[PDB]
Amino acid sequence: DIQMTQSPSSLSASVGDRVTITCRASQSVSSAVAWYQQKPGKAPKLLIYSASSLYSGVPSRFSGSRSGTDFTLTISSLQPEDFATYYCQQSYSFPSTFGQGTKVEIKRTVAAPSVFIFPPSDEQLKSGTASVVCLLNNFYPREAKVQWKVDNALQSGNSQESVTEQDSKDSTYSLSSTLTLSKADYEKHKVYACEVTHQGLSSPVTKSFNRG
Amino acid sequence: ISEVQLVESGGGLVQPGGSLRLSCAASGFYISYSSIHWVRQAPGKGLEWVASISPYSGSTYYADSVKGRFTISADTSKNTAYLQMNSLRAEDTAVYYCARQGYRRRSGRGFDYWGQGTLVTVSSASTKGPSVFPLAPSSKGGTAALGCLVKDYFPEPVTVSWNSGALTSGVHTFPAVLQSSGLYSLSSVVTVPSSSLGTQTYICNVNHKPSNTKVDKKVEPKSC
RNA sequence: GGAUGCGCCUUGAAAAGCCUGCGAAACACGCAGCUGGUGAAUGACAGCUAUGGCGCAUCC
Ligand SMILES: CN1/C(=C/c2sc3ccccc3[n+]2CCCS(=O)(=O)O)Oc2ccccc21
């Protein structure tokens, strides 16, 4: 089987940067190589075919090049909507094989999150569980620390986080942290707080509410 | 006119060891004169080519990880390609895409059209619909945030829209998380102007197809 | 929508094999002719006729 290996596997570049992604075939493939762009959860979109031909409708900042068994996708000047995973593919011999993908992230300036806290609904409380949600909206970089406190005691092991894909216009992230408690435990305590630490904040930001 | 389209169907939850077939219904071209490929993507992982069928001859090709268990075929009368999967294993769980290899003259051997993709989950677990709870805006950056929590469903996916699709600005629908219960949950939030909380209505439309759950939950502030 | 005009593609290489262009065309199937060039085993072709397409420009 022919193997395709891209380098790097992930990269972060600023708007306007020249980005180059490389892909190496283990055996000869004679420029039967295509490049695709894939947004998260969406079908891939063809960018380059026959190693170096720009597909109809693809912006001119994308180009492809061949040198022996090494193939290069170039983005001449990176745009915020170019955040994606890029894949090479050989179609010289069956079975066809894709590269492992290179994830391209847009590096931007630091942006501090806006923090919101959400108590459980009475509707959910009827069910015996309470979910407390903390929202971190429109921040950069991705790294952030969310700490839950219940009556000033630090929580551990009872929260989970999810983070959106990078925004296509402002390159920021949003993050949710969900604290899961039994109704019993929720009703035993008063102050529910999420404390957020992030590069864009001079000191941690705490959002809280009092049950009832 | 007939625009080129690939519409996949047949995805869902299936027990291991069984059989499941995916369909790829083509519009706008004659499927037996084109090359059709199946490509899959396990959650969080890379694209994996799975199989293909050649124009005019109908010759079929398969990846080793799949050969002998899957069969790709085409039906001219239905203009539809198929991926028959047998002896399903957990490693087969993935979003499956069908794709058309384009016209040599215009795009070489690149895949120029793709289906929307459909999730096949190979699991022994059972189907559970979600509960939808409001995330109410608070009484206190100039704007307000609100949302809905979609908790305890299986398998993926769920779709969420706001105001039947009229509200898209400021919406963030987070990736689902797998809870320790083995069920999924996710939140969808949107930021809106505080001044409009009394006037504008905000409804979160949640659809979980594998359980025929359609919910519309209004989100208003608490009286307090 | 109608006229005209321009351009382009409609292979190349031959015993075999391999490579390659076109035909919706990776395997299987199909691809007429002329002049020159090339090949002592080498894709290396140039300009065209014919037949099928495709794009651009002018004009009513
Ligand atoms: C058959 N054969 C061969 C013939 C050759 S070499 C050559 C070189 C210059 C001019 C003519 C020419 N010719 C014949 C032309 C007839 S034609 O093919 O044009 O009809 O050379 C071979 C070398 C190895 C194995 C078989 C071989």
Author numbering:
A (entry chain L): 2 to 213
B (entry chain H): 2 to 141, 145 to 228
Text taken from the publication that reported this structure:
DIR2s-OTB-SO3 RNA-fluorophore complex was co-crystallized with Fab BL3-6, and the structure was solved at 1.8 Å resolution with one Fab–RNA-fluorophore complex molecule per crystallographic asymmetric unit. The 1.8 Å-resolution electron density map allowed unambiguous tracing of the RNA and revealed a fluorophore-binding site with a clear non-nucleotide density corresponding to the fluorophore. The refined structural factors clearly showed electron density corresponding to the two rings of the OTB dye in planar configuration between the two layers formed by A40 and A41-G39. Although we observed no electron density corresponding to the propyl side chain of the OTB-SO3, we did observe clear electron density for the sulfonate group. Interactions between the two loops create the fluorophore-binding site, which consists of an unpaired nucleotide (A40) that caps the benzothiazolium ring from the top and a base triple formed by three purines (A15, G39, and A41) that provide a stacking platform for the two rings of OTB to sit in a planar configuration. Together the platform and the unpaired nucleotide form a claw-like structure that clamps down on the ligand. OTB’s propylsulfonate projects downward from the open end of the claw to position the sulfonate moiety for chelation by the G39′s amidinium group. In the crystal lattice, two complexes homodimerize via head-to-head stacking interactions involving the ligand-binding sites, resulting in nearly complete surface burial of the fluorophore. According to the structure, the monomeric form leaves the top face of the benzoxazole ring uncapped and exposed to solvent. This open feature likely relaxes the ligand specificity and accounts for the ability of the aptamer to bind both OTB-SO3, DIR-SO3, and TO1-Biotin.
